């Protein structure tokens, strides 16, 4: 399927234990996609002081359209010293491993794959 339907948990940044996908632009939306498909993917909401206490590059889920079963239409933009790497809407949020952390919320999207 070109879409498939995850519900993602969402984690208080100071939680998270492995802040990233690794280490350049193909490697952390080749991880995150992966992590996605696995289930072993949450999400960190985007406010002041959030991104830096994550690793670059970074991974966003990005509002791709204007809501299919209550999931919001996404796909990943990647992002490395201040370079996008893709073009989509509004930021959802970050994405990073789960390792096991508990959640604060689950994020239902319909991801572009």
């Given at each position: 399927k070109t879409h498939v339907q995850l519900s993602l948990p969402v984690l208080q940044v100071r939680d998270?234990?492995?802040?990233?996908?690794?280490?350049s632009v193909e490697e952390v939306l080749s991880e995150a996609r992966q992590h996605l498909k696995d289930g072993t993917c949450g999400l960190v909401e985007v406010e002041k002081g959030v991104l830096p206490q994550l690793e670059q590059p970074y991974v966003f889920i990005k509002r791709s359209d204007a809501a299919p079963h209550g999931h919001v239409m996404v796909e990943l933009v990647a992002e490395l010293e201040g370079i996008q790497y893709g073009r989509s809407g509004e930021t959802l949020g970050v994405l990073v491993p789960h390792v096991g952390e508990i959640p604060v919320a689950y994020r239902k999207v319909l991801l572009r794959k």
């Open positions: 998270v234990l492995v802040r990233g996908f690794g280490d």
